[PDB]
Amino acid sequence: QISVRGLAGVENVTELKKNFNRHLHFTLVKDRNVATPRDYYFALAHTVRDHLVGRWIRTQQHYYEKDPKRIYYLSLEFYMGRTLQNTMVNLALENACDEATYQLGLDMEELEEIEEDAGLGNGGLGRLAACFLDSMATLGLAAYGYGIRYEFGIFNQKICGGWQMEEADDWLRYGNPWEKARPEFTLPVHFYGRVEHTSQGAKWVDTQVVLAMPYDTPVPGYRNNVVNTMRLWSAKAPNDLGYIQAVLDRNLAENISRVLYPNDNFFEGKELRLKQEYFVVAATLQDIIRRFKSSTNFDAFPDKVAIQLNDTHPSLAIPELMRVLVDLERLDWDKAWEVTVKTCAYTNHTVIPEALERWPVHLLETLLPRHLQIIYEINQRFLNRVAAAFPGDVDRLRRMSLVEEGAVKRINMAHLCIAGSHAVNGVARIHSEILKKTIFKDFYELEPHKFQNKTNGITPRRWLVLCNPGLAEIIAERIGEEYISDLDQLRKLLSYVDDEAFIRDVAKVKQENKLKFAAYLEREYKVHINPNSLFDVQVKRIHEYKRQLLNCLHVITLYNRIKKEPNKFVVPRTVMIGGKAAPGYHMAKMIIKLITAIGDVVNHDPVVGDRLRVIFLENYRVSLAEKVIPAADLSEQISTAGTEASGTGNMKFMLNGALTIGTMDGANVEMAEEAGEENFFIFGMRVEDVDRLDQRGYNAQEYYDRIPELRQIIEQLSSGFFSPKQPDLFKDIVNMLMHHDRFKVFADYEEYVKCQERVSALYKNPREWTRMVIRNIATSGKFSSDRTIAQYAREIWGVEPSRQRLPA
Amino acid sequence: QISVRGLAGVENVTELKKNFNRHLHFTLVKDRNVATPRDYYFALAHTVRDHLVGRWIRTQQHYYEKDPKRIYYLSLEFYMGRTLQNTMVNLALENACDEATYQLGLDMEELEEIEEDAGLGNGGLGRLAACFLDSMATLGLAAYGYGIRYEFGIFNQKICGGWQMEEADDWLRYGNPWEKARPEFTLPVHFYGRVEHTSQGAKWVDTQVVLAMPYDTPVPGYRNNVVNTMRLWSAKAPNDLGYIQAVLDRNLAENISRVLYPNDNFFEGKELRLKQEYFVVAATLQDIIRRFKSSTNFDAFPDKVAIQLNDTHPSLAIPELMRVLVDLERLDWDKAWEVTVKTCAYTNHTVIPEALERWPVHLLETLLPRHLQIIYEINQRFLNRVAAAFPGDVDRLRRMSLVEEGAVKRINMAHLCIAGSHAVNGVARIHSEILKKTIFKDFYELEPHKFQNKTNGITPRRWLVLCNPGLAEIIAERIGEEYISDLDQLRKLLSYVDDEAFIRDVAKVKQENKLKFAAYLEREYKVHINPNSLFDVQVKRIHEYKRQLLNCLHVITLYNRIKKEPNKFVVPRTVMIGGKAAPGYHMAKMIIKLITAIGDVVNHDPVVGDRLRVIFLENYRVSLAEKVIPAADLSEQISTAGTEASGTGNMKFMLNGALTIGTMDGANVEMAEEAGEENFFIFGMRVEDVDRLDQRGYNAQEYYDRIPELRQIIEQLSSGFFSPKQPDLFKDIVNMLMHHDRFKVFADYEEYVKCQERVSALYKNPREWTRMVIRNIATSGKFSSDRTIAQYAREIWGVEPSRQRLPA
Ligand SMILES: OC[C@H]1O[C@H](O[C@H]2[C@H](O)[C@@H](O)[C@@H](O[C@H]3[C@H](O)[C@@H](O)[C@@H](O[C@H]4[C@H](O)[C@@H](O)[C@@H](O[C@H]5[C@H](O)[C@@H](O)[C@@H](O)O[C@@H]5CO)O[C@@H]4CO)O[C@@H]3CO)O[C@@H]2CO)[C@H](O)[C@@H](O)[C@@H]1O
Ligand SMILES: OC[C@H]1O[C@H](O[C@H]2[C@H](O)[C@@H](O)[C@@H](O[C@H]3[C@H](O)[C@@H](O)[C@@H](O[C@H]4[C@H](O)[C@@H](O)[C@@H](O[C@H]5[C@H](O)[C@@H](O)[C@@H](O)O[C@@H]5CO)O[C@@H]4CO)O[C@@H]3CO)O[C@@H]2CO)[C@H](O)[C@@H](O)[C@@H]1O
Ligand SMILES: *Cc1c(COP(=O)(O)O)cnc(C)c1O
Ligand SMILES: *Cc1c(COP(=O)(O)O)cnc(C)c1O
Numbered sequence A, B: 001q002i003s004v005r006g007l008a009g010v011e012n013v014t015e016l017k018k019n020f021n022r023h024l025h026f027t028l029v030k031d032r033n034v035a036t037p038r039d040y041y042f043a044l045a046h047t048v049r050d051h052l053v054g055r056w057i058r059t060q061q062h063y064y065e066k067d068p069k070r071i072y073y074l075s076l077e078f079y080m081g082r083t084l085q086n087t088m089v090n091l092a093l094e095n096a097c098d099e100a101t102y103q104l105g106l107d108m109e110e111l112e113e114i115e116e117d118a119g120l121g122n123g124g125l126g127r128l129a130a131c132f133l134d135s136m137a138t139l140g141l142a143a144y145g146y147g148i149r150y151e152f153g154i155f156n157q158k159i160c161g162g163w164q165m166e167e168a169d170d171w172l173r174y175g176n177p178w179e180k181a182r183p184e185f186t187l188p189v190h191f192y193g194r195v196e197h198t199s200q201g202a203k204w205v206d207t208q209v210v211l212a213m214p215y216d217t218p219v220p221g222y223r224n225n226v227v228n229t230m231r232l233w234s235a236k237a238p239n240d241l242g243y244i245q246a247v248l249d250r251n252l253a254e255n256i257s258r259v260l261y262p263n264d265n266f267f268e269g270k271e272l273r274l275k276q277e278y279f280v281v282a283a284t285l286q287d288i289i290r291r292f293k294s295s296t297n298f299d300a301f302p303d304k305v306a307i308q309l310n311d312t313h314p315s316l317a318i319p320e321l322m323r324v325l326v327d328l329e330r331l332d333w334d335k336a337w338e339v340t341v342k343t344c345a346y347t348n349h350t351v352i353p354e355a356l357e358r359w360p361v362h363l364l365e366t367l368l369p370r371h372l373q374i375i376y377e378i379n380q381r382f383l384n385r386v387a388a389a390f391p392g393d394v395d396r397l398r399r400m401s402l403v404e405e406g407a408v409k410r411i412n413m414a415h416l417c418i419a420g421s422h423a424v425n426g427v428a429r430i431h432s433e434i435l436k437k438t439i440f441k442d443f444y445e446l447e448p449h450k451f452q453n454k455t456n457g458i459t460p461r462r463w464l465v466l467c468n469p470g471l472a473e474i475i476a477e478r479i480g481e482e483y484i485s486d487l488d489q490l491r492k493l494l495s496y497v498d499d500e501a502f503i504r505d506v507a508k509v510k511q512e513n514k515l516k517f518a519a520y521l522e523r524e525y526k527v528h529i530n531p532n533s534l535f536d537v538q539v540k541r542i543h544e545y546k547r548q549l550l551n552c553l554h555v556i557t558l559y560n561r562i563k564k565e566p567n568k569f570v571v572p573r574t575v576m577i578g579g580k581a582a583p584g585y586h587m588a589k590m591i592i593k594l595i596t597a598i599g600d601v602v603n604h605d606p607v608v609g610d611r612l613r614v615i616f617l618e619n620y621r622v623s624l625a626e627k628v629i630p631a632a633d634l635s636e637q638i639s640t641a642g643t644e645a646s647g648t649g650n651m652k653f654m655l656n657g658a659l660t661i662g663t664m665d666g667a668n669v670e671m672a673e674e675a676g677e678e679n680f681f682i683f684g685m686r687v688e689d690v691d692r693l694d695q696r697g698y699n700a701q702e703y704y705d706r707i708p709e710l711r712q713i714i715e716q717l718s719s720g721f722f723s724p725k726q727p728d729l730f731k732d733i734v735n736m737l738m739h740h741d742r743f744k745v746f747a748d749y750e751e752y753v754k755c756q757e758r759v760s761a762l763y764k765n766p767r768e769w770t771r772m773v774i775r776n777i778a779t780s781g782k783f784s785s786d787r788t789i790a791q792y793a794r795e796i797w798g799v800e801p802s803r804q805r806l807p808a
Helices: A010-027 A037-066 A084-090 A094-103 A108-112 A124-138 A243-248 A251-257 A271-293 A298-304 A317-328 A333-343 A361-367 A369-389 A394-400 A413-419 A429-437 A441-446 A461-466 A469-479 A487-496 A500-525 A548-564 A586-602 A622-628 A649-655 A668-675 A687-696 A700-706 A708-719 A731-739 A746-763 A766-778 A785-797 B010-027 B037-066 B084-090 B094-103 B108-112 B124-138 B243-248 B251-257 B271-293 B298-304 B317-328 B333-343 B361-367 B369-389 B394-400 B413-419 B429-437 B441-446 B461-466 B469-479 B487-496 B500-525 B548-564 B586-602 B622-628 B649-655 B668-675 B687-696 B700-706 B708-719 B731-739 B746-763 B766-778 B785-797
Strands: A070-074 A078-081 A118-120 A143-148 A156-160 A163-167 A187-191 A194-198 A201-205 A208-220 A227-236 A305-310 A344-347 A358-360 A410-412 A423-426 A451-453 A534-539 A573-578 A612-617 A634-637 A659-662 B070-074 B078-081 B118-120 B143-148 B156-160 B163-167 B187-191 B194-198 B201-205 B208-220 B227-236 B305-310 B344-347 B358-360 B410-412 B423-426 B451-453 B534-539 B573-578 B612-617 B634-637 B659-662
Touching (some): A010 A094, A037 A094, A037 A227, A124 A305, A124 A461, A124 A785, A163 A586, A201 A369, A227 A271, A251 A271, A305 A317, A333 A344, A469 A487, A500 A622, A500 A766, A534 A746, A548 A573, A586 A731, A649 A659, A649 A668, A659 A766, A700 A746, B037 B208, B124 B227, B208 B251, B298 B333, B317 B344, B358 B361, B423 B785, B429 B441, B461 B469, B469 B487, B487 B766, B500 B766, B548 B573, B548 B708, B573 B622, B634 B649, B649 B659, B649 B766, B659 B746, B700 B746, B708 B731, B708 B746, B746 B766
Parallel strands (some): A070 A305, A573 A612, A634 A659, B143 B227, B534 B634, B634 B659
Antiparallel strands (some): A187 A208, A194 A201, A208 A227, B078 B118, B156 B163
16 A cells, blocks of 8 residues: 555465465464454464565575674563564565455454564663664674563553552463474573582582573564574473472472563562573573584684673673683683683663662572682682772772672672673763763773763664554655665655645644544543644653653643633643553552542543643553554653663654653753754753752752742642542652652753743644654654664674675 | 375375475474474474364364264373374375375384373373274264363383382473464363352352363364364463562462373372362363353253263262352252253272272362352252162161261262262273172162163274284285274184184284384383293283282292203293382382392393393383284283273283283173183182182281292292392382282282193194184274274263264
């Protein structure tokens, strides 16, 4: 139907229908009289999967022939979402399948909604891994994604009485047609035991063994016939144990890959989590060595292998590589260390202290005896280096140590990663600068060459073509289809900023997206929004640093002003906030309840009418993001300056036609820099302002006494205006805002409200609002993960990206 | 190659090769350069499975159209074994696939050995369920096998230092291509809770819920295009639960279908086992009712439904049916009871007291509150009936009660089954008689019409055509192929008893089978047997009543006689004993060690040479039975008269050309009756003799004092002749034989040894031994499970069997 969805040839459609019926019959063992939409979704999925296998097999064969340098991306999270439509898009099969299903009397869009999201991630960090795999395949890199196949991903969020309830995400219930179990490649992982020191070196013995079974999922590049692999490990117990209990206790070993820890930017030192981290690391490294030996001196190891650590979660890769090289291969320490540093690279994702991994020594000592010895040895040699470079600087030695002293000794995994990696990067310019100015300043001074920046990005395939066909289409009509795999070309759209036709089309697509979402909202949630109002949306994990609370304050302010002057005109808005809170993050759960509570007052106030609506989007996940983002007008990125390392949701909104209101934080800075500050709604303290406020001391009371509108809001919360039956329900919120606000919500309130008035003024002028929108879209090319990946490839991994098509 | 394996048409072979390559590519995602035998086995399996689906779908459709009476076989065990070859046989695809694989350069027999046995059974009872499903499909009955999909079947037995070691049977590791998960038909099962009595009747509330997910496996009839279904339930936890632990505790609910209790003819009142029994029953009945309502008065229920209980394991079906009819459908008690009795039938499998299920009331009270109330109510009305028929007979009331009084009240599940069933049958004439003369005498006097006999049988497909192609072939050359689905025809072979050619062929096939097994024994076990010796084999679960110990005594006697007169001629023998012992059956584990210990002395004694060898066949299972049975000369069926209800292994040996030495027990009686006593080696006490011995009192000492050869053997065991480093290792064995032998091993020793001398005398005359063999094979037709099933169908279920071919 639309150009970018590919061609629908008669032979292709005919063959697709044939294979669809074959799978429904032979694979699902069903007939058209008993089949359900679910059965139809699976028949189509297996049909599309088939077109993938041929390419998957020759791609891997190609890598065996050419034997290029291999990139290994280690992450405990891969927030994939659905893969049916994405596969059709990358294979140019969308229109053919749409026609083929149409002729079979089926609605393809209805079938796509049946697929379960592969929610093996928490948010930012995990989605980045997903976008990265896509870009790596699209750039012809011999890359492999390695992780854990959690049988339960991020929990499904339900709202009961305004509160969040967690439900197990049993995403494998009906099966996963995309993965291929490879039980023949199972590997053993060791735990516990003890260390014996012989004349032949150290030996790790009397260990408990857990098997790692791999499941491979194909990762298709964009129309280049390249299909890479994402290998996920599953835990299995050895078969060799009264008898019944021994068999039942197998679950203890298999619990390792049972569930994803639902923590976003927060560390929890639990033993099960440490086992998961070592489990993925140990199995992946054996696989890497095995594949390498099929290519015995490891001097060439770094020339054939690149290991990228997504945060510190897979940090044990460093001492595990040393263990294998030293203990098993028998290389001398110094040589093994050279190899390790040259193959490992580390990416930091946050600077907040509570997110930093610091494992108690007594834990590593019991679970991984040998690794702790190796870490201590790495530390000694590292401090000897620090001592020799900064003679007499004793405090520097204690600050840089990988071992933190105190009541309980801990291992700072971030320090371990810096020491054992040849490259350390932040995820946005301002974040990377902050890393060498503060948190890792001592390390930067010792080895300035290791620090780099690699600004995050998102894939234009899933985040434009797949979720916003209408926009991709009207862009293609004017500049072609080349931008899809080279986003910088969108810059050519700057020529149509005055084109009356384009302006009308951009505005038309947005309205259609809003209508479609307003409908979806009513269908699956029986809510009630006005498609003409401004869609003000803030979707991301619930966090105090992300400041959904600042957003709440604005909402209440709008409401109080309306009640103040009921018959005054105000731009209509539909404020949508969505996101999950970690199960044990009390404050985050309280913020969700506040949001729904505000909605209960505002949405049922007759005087407000349909001028203001506050909706809480439940179970925010990748598939939901693909729906709400294209329909948004205003993107809320209001974290306190210096806290959001980069952000990626911000980029998604920019690419889909929404204007951005936000602080100079993370990538917001580079976005505004790319679009021009006049085309962004920047407000609030800059990083320097937050620093001055801390030096002096943050006194929330001051803002409370000087801003009557703010005072009124706080008093309403305290008196129980938003919780009649529970007058003090929100006392924790008020107390935190007034006395223990680490994120200075009040400090940015005034400027935020003023800035919000200016976006309202611009929305009243449809033509000008849309022209500013065109200006944002036209300059968002830099935030394509293809650019990001090409920089990692050239500046860290030492490989050259390719657009060369692979033989079909 | 051989006639009975079907035709190998050019088009069929061509199509098979094509589909084989398609599955290797698209399904296994492999290429001929990386594929392993395992991959090849799977490619072939999926290819054969395909030919099954078309028939599977129309068969079920056919039943929907015709709506015939449905047979539901409830069993907690289905000892299936491998299904690849059996499927080819029933579909006449064996030769085509053999050729197709040959042309692809593969050995089909090698690929078949890769398939894992579906060992979801313990022995007799479970294999009977498997043979039954096969016969029911072959006789065109609308039958469904219902059970539990254990993820761990009967343990794999390994021998270490002569001792049995149990290893988890992870049969699903590489996947099961035969099953089809049907998560869309998941059903809820309730546990615990309490009972509320309202004005609207009883209500079972506050229950814990466990989901039952079904997996369907196709069951093809023999060349009739009928494919029935075996539905196995798997336990799954509901999704609605700190957070992590709640997700991990899901394993508690899913443990229900984790493993098969490895007990053969022995009861263990564990809670997990009771949950398994209710789990299979509750899910199956909802499925039965649901399917019935798609055919509201239940007066016609018994006309459309037959429920067969394989032993008392699924006995809760009776009170569960009452619960649903009374509590949910609201039928009056009396009406519901009439329906229940008319749809349920019970099959008893043993008379040994330790095997009888007697569940403690406090257990049923906690786990199934409502069912216990229903059982009490069933009991009261039943005893009122007994009281009215036998006025004043108070002791009769206590004996017939379903509730056993004492320190701990228990529910006799066998009494529950008799009361709620319209038919109760034994599994062999002598067993069924024993049921009404002793154990169920009171019940037989109250309702003589309920008692019947249904002598067990085995399927001639798996137990002749599949495991002994050579014999089936030479039989077919002379009388055609019709006998395969009508075993009585083998009786026509009696005409060739004097045919010199036939005699030579029968003897040739046996020798080839022995050579092939002697080879297999050396390949996978590096053992060392002489193909010319007599193959004396006893394979079955290890039990004191089966008397492997009596066999051991003969072995030692042969050995002692050889040492006595070294240069005397004796017919060479290879004594093979195999079978698993339940993990907690100490005595059974001791018997295995004795057997291997005897082998250590006998097999390494230079004077004996290759005149006597004692081998312990480890990990005896269905696939192993298919190999050793065809190669046997002598079948050992020596249980103490009155203990082996029927036996089925005995039948397998008779059909495959082995002569039988055994007691007048179980089906041995009917076999000897069919072949003629002169063609059987019967010895020992009859049931009447065991009774007289008990009245008088069994004194093992008497036999010890009167039989010097027996005394010598006992003294060797005591002094440590078979355990030098552990002189008293077998003190438990000796003590049991001498003072607490419930099975009177010594009482049959003398006659057993004498009878064994006569089989040796006959083996010295090849021609006559073979003629007696032909006489056994020719009269084994009665023991076909097709005959058994036709009798159940006509005398219990009320349906007529069919040989009508179904449209291809
Ligand atoms: O096998 C070679 C090696 O073995 C032996 O050394 C090992 C140690 O026995 C073992 O304990 C481990 O040493 C760790 C140490 O346990 C751990 O606490 C850490 O120590 C650091 C501090 O973390 C760091 O702060 C700094 O300490 C300062 C302190 O901060 C300051 O306030 C004040 O207290 O002075 C302290 C020292 O001046 O430095 C120490 C270490 O200098 O890290 C240690 C090393 O990682 O591992 C050792 C080697 O593996 C033998 O004893 C040794 O001879 C052999 O060379
Ligand atoms: O709702 C209708 C019904 O409810 C109530 O009756 C119920 C009982 O309250 C309840 O306990 C249960 O009764 C069971 C009984 O608990 C259980 O022990 C069993 O009793 C049998 C013995 O098993 C049997 O041996 C025999 O007992 C002899 C005994 O052997 C002999 O040695 C000597 O002791 O005398 C005894 C009696 O003469 O018979 C008893 C019963 O006669 O089975 C009972 C019934 O299954 O369930 C009852 C009904 O569900 C009300 O009390 C009653 O009025 C209502 O009709
Ligand atoms: C892109 C995305 C995120 C990251 O959003 P931020 O606003 O950077 O935190 C989180 N969750 C989902 C489902 C996403 O698609
Ligand atoms: C047939 C069979 C049995 C039953 O044998 P009996 O001698 O009757 O106990 C047990 N196990 C297997 C594997 C069988 O094939």
